[PDB]
Structure formats: structure tokens, C-alpha cells
Amino acid sequence: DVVVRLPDVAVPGEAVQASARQAVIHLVDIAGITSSTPADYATKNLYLWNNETCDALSAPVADWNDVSTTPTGSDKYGPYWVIPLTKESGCINVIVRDGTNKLIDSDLRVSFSDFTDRTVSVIAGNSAVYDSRADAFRAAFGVALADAHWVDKTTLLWPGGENKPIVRLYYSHSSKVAADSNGEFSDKYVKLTPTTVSQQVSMRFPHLASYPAFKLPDDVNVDELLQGETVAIAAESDGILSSATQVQTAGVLDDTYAAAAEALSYGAQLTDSGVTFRVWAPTAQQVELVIYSADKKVIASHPMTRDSASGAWSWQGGSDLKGAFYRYAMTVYHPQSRKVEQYEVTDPYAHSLSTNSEYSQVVDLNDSALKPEGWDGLTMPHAQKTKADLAKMTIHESHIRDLSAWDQTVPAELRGKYLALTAQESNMVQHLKQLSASGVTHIELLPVFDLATVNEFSDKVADIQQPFSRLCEVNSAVKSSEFAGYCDSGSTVEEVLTQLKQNDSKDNPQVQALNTLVAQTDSYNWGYDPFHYTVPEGSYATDPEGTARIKEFRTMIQAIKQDLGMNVIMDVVYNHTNAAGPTDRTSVLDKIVPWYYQRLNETTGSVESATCCSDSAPEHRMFAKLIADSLAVWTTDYKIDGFRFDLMLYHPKAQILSAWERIKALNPDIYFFGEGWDSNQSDRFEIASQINLKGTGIGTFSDRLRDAVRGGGPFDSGDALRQNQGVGSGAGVLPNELTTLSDDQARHLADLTRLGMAGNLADFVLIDKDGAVKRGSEIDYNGAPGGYAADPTEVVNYVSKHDNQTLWDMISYKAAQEADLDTRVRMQAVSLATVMLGQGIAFDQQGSELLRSKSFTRDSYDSGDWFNRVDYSLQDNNYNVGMPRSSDDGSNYDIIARVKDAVATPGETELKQMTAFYQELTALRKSSPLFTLGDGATVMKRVDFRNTGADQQTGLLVMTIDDGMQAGASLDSRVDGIVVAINAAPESRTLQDFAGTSLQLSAIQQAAGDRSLASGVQVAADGSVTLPAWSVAVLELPQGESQGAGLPVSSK
């Protein structure tokens, strides 16, 4: 065996040592050192400049394009620069370049307190600064990056090993792999030989299938390598090092342990006979179960028992540990720090927690003490069994603080809490009860699992209803800000924000200036920040310490289902964790099995952040299991009726479907859906996208009718926000002063809208804007097939959601200056009509029925009670309460200032009219099964459109739904057919399509009189129907003695 060693060159001394008013920077050049050959470093140069952070440089060259700051000299080890300074304290900014290309991505900051001799060394592609070339040399010819992948028991994939005579896997249990003082790599190793990637590996890891493959001896003690650091090293045949890198091990962890580990159950499993704790930690060197008293004193520390087949650790004790607080004391190598870390971590399978999630807690969720009276018999108020059942789903996407934080008729101590839903006499609950009575069927809850980003210790939090003095007490940023003079005022924070409104504008956005500071220490966050996946959030409980929150959560679920009569959907956020690495307070999973539960860059091993935060890896078997097990608890123990997967596109199709198969065994009628856009993970696995989920019964949000009715798309900012009008805001037919939308473009949006009203099916046949016969898949959506679904239950239509601007704020952005306030209210209703009267599942943001505004805030996740306010006393819609946060919306300030004051802010009259409009629409959808056929083939047999093609009246949507003899059986004994007419236009429109029929305006709309969306509709003798501007009419063929002719779909 040849010894792997450093280059036969000697470890370098310093080329020059900085003198007075100088710094020296060495570049250790690996290429030039390995090459025998002399190097002309004339293309190497420094870009140097002073800023407020670093300012010690003397007369640095200003121009970026100036490459003439070439090396002062060079030797075999590389170039070096002698840099003139003005002082020897502080730090300098340095960008090391070749030509004008950065050799180090990090913009370096050489600190003269970190390195007091001001003589430093760096290596191309390495962000670290070294005190000597000797240190840099050992690093340049040491371990770098992490681009080797130990993907199964006997397979290593690694580009660094290609063509090299010696490829080895070096390992060290308690230290880092590194060369000794003789420059020899003296740790233990496994020898690897070249091989071809297997079919199994290429199937599992298609994004790695082009990597050079190397084979381990099929008898290696894998457990012994996996307990510490492993490093892949390649060398030349004389043993001289080629490269060394860290090893990503999730693959071999799954191949070695996953099946054995999948067969076990995890967490603190409490049951009569005792308790069994189990945690998966297949790389850990030691795991102890630490038991804590209620006052958080250690009362025991138990070495756990490792199971060799699975890599799980278990500990079995008596039932006296019920209610005990506990953590897992880990001894485990973390590849990010390259240290055998020592720390206590809460249970990833925690089912109860202490305040702020510091300790997990042993709980039996089956305990009757943790349930409201009657909980076990709680039934789902709305059926979800058939597709017809599912299609009735009409969702109200809500947030615990958005519901009750402002409602003075909710008891003060329940505002912002789960139990606010029990305050039957409150404005908010009475409003939801009427929404349910009129046909809202589901409450969807924004994150109510354990989020990280609200402090659950009440003393560390200040909300805007509390004294400004409390805010100063808990928030040193406020106390050091321009607002510090309010500290000893006697005003509440809300009182201050209110007085800041009058002088707030784009040139003085002081409301959001204060609110941005308030956001850091208030109770408010959407919560897409997972701390523990299977514990209720603590801050929404009146008592966040211990099991209390569990009963309060269930009391809320029971109130929504039993007393409000609505099903419950939970937002889940398995696509990322709040943090990873060995340090962060909220890194749980990545402390316990480092580098396994996060998705990592193939070259560097950095946790990726395509999401907001620390991307998870649901393609890994034990995280797929964690997800399914978590969903099982929410389903069984919390009686959740459905789940919305945040960013579902970062999950494999196979994993979401496996989860659904598992949960259907517990609740056969559970419904899964999520945001299924096309993602960038398709090189790693088939993603759970709109296209790939076709026919599976997993729903996805549709961006098709959304964009067509709202106008524009999620990538818009600046003038596009106003120019890109939608069907709901008058594309083509009521242009604003900025837009250039053509009539052809407006009719394309109507084609997408009709398609979406028919369920956005791939095979639905319609007549497009040009008179052409088109299947839904042939209607273009920004280059993609527009119709993608098999059944309308696979499509969730919407025109407003918690993310991006509210519908009202978009109408305010887009509406023509001459559209008055009453017209804009009808625009809101007409936009919602395309959703509520369509065949796809209907989804909507809490408060659209109240013209909800966020004061133009686009992304309000941390914009507090102020911008997310919903006023259930109906005094206004929260419009014009200050400029939104400048960091994200500042580039919109110009367009906001131009549009904001076009009309008055809605008041009680407009909000009451909007709620009437809204409940009219939901009542119509609820009233007949024809609106909610469920099955795509049935939609194709029954649903058609009029006013199509080249001669259409723009903006007039006319849909027919057949219940007559040609469709099959009568699904609705009262009618033979329905017509949905949405006149999204400022003209009256007359229809002759139904001349000679016995069409009648629906009784529901007639009863509303001049408060109806159909106010002023005329159904003449001859059967012609006229609709006023900005109106919606549902008309029907009354059913007689037998099923009649109906409205048969036209042959196309």
C-alpha cells in the first residue's frame, strides 16, 4: 500500500512580511504548485476599496475594470501583494481576481485584529483567511468541499477520483482526517476500485448518475466509518495527493438502516404498561435520554440502547414518566463543523413541549384529560368521500391572529388564541357562522403546528395593543431607534402607529418604519417556520407550558366542526426546516442525524434554500416516514380533515402518494393538496406537480384562472401591477391609463377563465377566442398546457391567498380611475364568482368577503397585526393604513401613490354589501350538485360555454351545465340545467342563446332584490336575458313531471 502524502515541495514560509503601513496577501496556487512549470501570474490582481465597514486601505484603485494591481512578486507557491495602508487597525476589503473574474466568491475582509501582523494567505475558491502560507498550504492540500457521495453500502460517487490510481475512503472516529506533521495521511482507510454506476443507484439518484463510480469491498464495517468523519482521498500512483473532500452519507444511511428503521415507531411512546422512547440516530456515538423536572432540573440521564439493524436508540421505563420533560443528549459528528458535537436536542417526534419548545414532554394524546367533552364522537360535518362530495369544498384560508387579534368582542384573554373560535357571541365567530350557513364549508388553518418565529415566553413579547413602554422593555432595536422618545410616553404602540398615519407617505413611510421593528418581538407570524412538526403551536394557547395547548387546540377543532359546521384543513410545511447545522436553537433534525434530513448541494454539502429556509429532503426514507407519521397524528389524534402541503413541488410525487396511501388507511376520506408548480428538483426525482399529479386525486392550486382573473402574475412589480389588468378588473373592456392589453389578450384571459370554471381539465373541449376547437391542454398558459387535470377535484381555483397582494389591493392597483367604489366592490364579487361558480374546488383568503386590504403589502408574513388586520366590526377593510414595508414593496411606492386615493376607502355599507354578494355566491354553489360534478368525464358530458369565438362580447362569461336527458340522470330534481352568466364589463349585455327556453332567474338571487349580484337582470318573454354591467346571474330551467331537454353540450 502506497502512503498518501502532501506534495514533495516543502511547506512554504512567508514570501514577505508586512512592514509599517502595509498589508500582505499571499495567493496559494494549487495548479502552479502541482505543475512543474513556471507561472506568469500577470492576470492575477486585487480589486480593493474602502467602505464604512473596512477603511484601512490607502488610495485604492477606483475602477473595477482596472486589472493592473498585479502581484508584487511570486514564487513556486503563488503570487503575493504588498498593499499600502493608512493605518494598522481595522480591516480591508479585498476581491481576489483573474482578469475581472472573482477567484473567491466571498468578498474578503482581512481583519487586522484577527491577524495582527497583517500578513495573510488565501486559496482560490476558499473563503477562509489564514495567518501564514504554511496554514494555507496544508488547507489547499487538505480536505475541501463535500462532493463525494457514499450512496449505498458499496458505492461511492465522486468526480475527484476520476482516472486516479489511488482512491480511498479515510476515516477518523474522534478527530478530523488530516495529514500528520510528516505530511502523510496516516488515518485508517478503505481502498476503492473504479466501477460503473448500478441501475439501482442511478434510479435512486438520477442527478448523480453521471458521477464517476467507485466500489468498496463488500465486507466493510460501514457502522464504524459512519460514526465519525469520513473523507474521500485520491492520489497519484507515487502516493502524492490529488484531492480530498468530505462525504455525503444520506444514501448509504438509507441503504444500511432505513428498512430496519422504518419498521419501528418513534418518540416518547406512553402506554399503560410504561413508556418506550425511540430516536433514529444512526451516526451518533452516544445518546442519553435526559429527564427533567417541571422546573427543568435534571432528575436522570439514561444511556440509551442502540439497535444495530436500524441505528435507532431506545429506552424503556415505567408509566411514572407521564408528563416528564426530556431531551436527547447527543454525541454526534456534524460534517458542517467537522466536530463530534455534544448537545441536548428536543424530540423530532415530540408530541408535547414546554414553553417555547425548549424541552419535549411525554404525553399520551389518547388521555381523556387532554380532550374536550364529546371529542371521540366528533364527526366531519361535510362529506369528502366521492368526487362530487369533494367538489363542494369551499375553503376559507384563515390565521389564528388574523381572526381575533382585533376583535374587541372576543374576550381579551382569547384574542389571538385557538379558543377565540369558542366565543360564540363575538363578531368574528358570528361572521364565520353565517359564512358557514351560506356555504363556506372548510376552514383552512395557516401554521398551527409548532412554529419557531414567535417567542412563547410572554414576557419577551410586546404587541401593539400594549404600552409603548413594554415594547421598549423587550426590544432594544426600538429603544435605540428614532421612535425611542415614545418609550416613556403613556401611549400604546397602536396609538403611536395611528398618529403616524396622517404624515405617512412614500417619502416618509414611518408607519412601516416603526412596524418593522415591532415585528421582531410581537406575537405575529404566518408560521411557515417549522420547529416541531407534530405539536400544536404554543403561543396560540392561553398556557404554553406543557400539555395545556393540546386540549385547547382540540377544543378549537371541535368548535369549528361541531358549532360552526365546517371541516378543517391544516397547512403543513414539510418542505423545509426553520434551521439546520449544529448551532441554531431551532435546528432539531439536523442536530440528531446531521446532513440527512436536509437537501444538500452536490458539490459543497451546504443545505439548500430554494425554499425560504433550510430545504428538507422528503426523498430520504426516514424523512418520508417522519412526514407520514406526523400526518397520522394530526389525522387520528386531532381529527384534521385535509392537508395543504406548502411548496408541495419540492416533494417527490411518490412520497406524497405514499403518504396519502398511509393516511387513507386511517381516514379514508382525507384530502391532500398543495402548491404544485414546476420546480427545479426534477433532476432529482419526479416532483409532485400539477402535471405529474394528473389523475392521482391529489389536488393542486391552479395558477391559470388565478392569473386570468386577477391579472398579471406573481413576478410582477412596478408598473406591471397596474398595466396587467385581469378579467375581474376590466382587461380590454375598461382599460386604465397605463395598460396596453389588446382585445386579443383579454380574450385569451377569458379562455383560461372559462377553462378554469370547467375544472381546468386537460381534455375539456372549448371554442377559443379565435373560434378554434381546443382541448384544455391546448390553451396556452405562458408556454405550458393550460388544462392539466383529470378531474375538477384535482384543481383548486382561487383569486386571493395569504401570499401576494389581496384581491382588493390588486383591484386598487388595476382598476381604471373612472371605476367608482361600488363598481370596484362588484369587481371583487365578479372575480370571486369565477371561483365560487366554477367546477374546481373553491379556495379563498379570509376576508375577501370584507374587501380585505393589507395596505398594498405584497408579502405580509411578518407585517404584524397592523397590516394583516381584519375588522369584524365592519368599519373599514384596512385599506390606506400606511405605506407597506419598504424592503419588499419600496419599488412599488410610486405606483401605489398614484393609484391609492382614486376612490374612498370601503366602510360599513360596502363591507355589508360585499358580504351579501359573497354569501349569495357561496349559497348558489351549495344549492345544486350541478356546480360540483366532481368527475371530469361528467364535466365533459354536461358543461359548455356560450359567447365564445371571434364574435364574442368581451368579458361576458356564459357557462351552461346540463341536467337534461342527454347528460344522463337528473342530479337535481328542481332543474333541468343551469346557466352561469358573469358580465365582467361596464356595458349591459343581452343574450339570445336561450331564446325560446323557459329560463328563469334563480330564486336565491331574486330574493336578494337590488342587493343581488343579479340586480336589474331581465329575463324577457321571448327568453332573451339582459345583464347590467358588472353582474352575475345564475339562471335555471325548472324541472317538470319528467326530466327535460336541458342544455346539451354542443358537438365540436
Ligand SMILES: [Mg+2]
Ligand atoms: Mg501572518
Ligand SMILES: [Mg+2]
Ligand atoms: Mg412555537
Ligand SMILES: [Mg+2]
Ligand atoms: Mg413578528
Ligand SMILES: [Mg+2]
Ligand atoms: Mg438541485
Ligand SMILES: [Mg+2]
Ligand atoms: Mg334535474
